[PDB]
Amino acid sequence: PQITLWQRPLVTIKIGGQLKEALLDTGADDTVLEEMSLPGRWKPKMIGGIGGFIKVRQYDQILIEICGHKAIGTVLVGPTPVNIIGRNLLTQIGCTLNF
Amino acid sequence: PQITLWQRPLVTIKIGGQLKEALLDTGADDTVLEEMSLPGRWKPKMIGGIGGFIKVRQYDQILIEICGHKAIGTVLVGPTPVNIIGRNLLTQIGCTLNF
């Protein structure tokens, strides 16, 4: 679908048998989600945003269902203020910026 | 122009008689540019990010020619790693998220 930006591009995703709301972020290289229970092994990692860095856990091969569309990629779990759909996932669902 | 997301969507902007490159961030309510000099006056303001809060100077009525498109709005300047064109401006140039 088409999304104007007069409001935050929030959409509903399905992950780990759970439902959430993630922001479609072209400004994000990766995908980071609020602390949640996820099965499988992970790997420590650090990402640097505007306010600084945060200690997140790196999950590979995690299936996410963005607004219906199913995709699988690397999901980061940490102390983020909002759920973020980064370009690693956005390019799988074919999201494009236009104007 | 249609922009895919395989790489960070960098756009060439022109502000204060200066040329720069800014990221089209759909996950940014406002626009924050790196440290630079500007004519108008400002007002201390802080914004929440991923790793914490930074203090920026606010400016209203700032002309910005985003990739051949002239728009005007509130710009913020501070300790931001990259230049960011948020939604307060993206809408002015009819930028749409699509998939």
Ligand SMILES: Cc1cccc(C)c1OCC(=O)N[C@@H](Cc1ccccc1)[C@@H](O)C[C@H](Cc1ccccc1)NC(=O)[C@H](C(C)C)N1CCCNC1=O
């Ligand atoms: C939310 C907001 C309100 C008012 C004004 C502004 C500028 C606002 O946005 C601030 C902000 O942190 N926005 C983020 C999403 C956001 C909204 C609300 C709360 C917290 C975050 C996101 O869009 C952009 C920001 C840009 C960036 C900054 C420094 C270095 C590199 C990239 N991107 C990142 O942090 C990403 C993360 C998410 C994987 N990131 C970090 C590792 C390297 N690459 C990368 O892409």
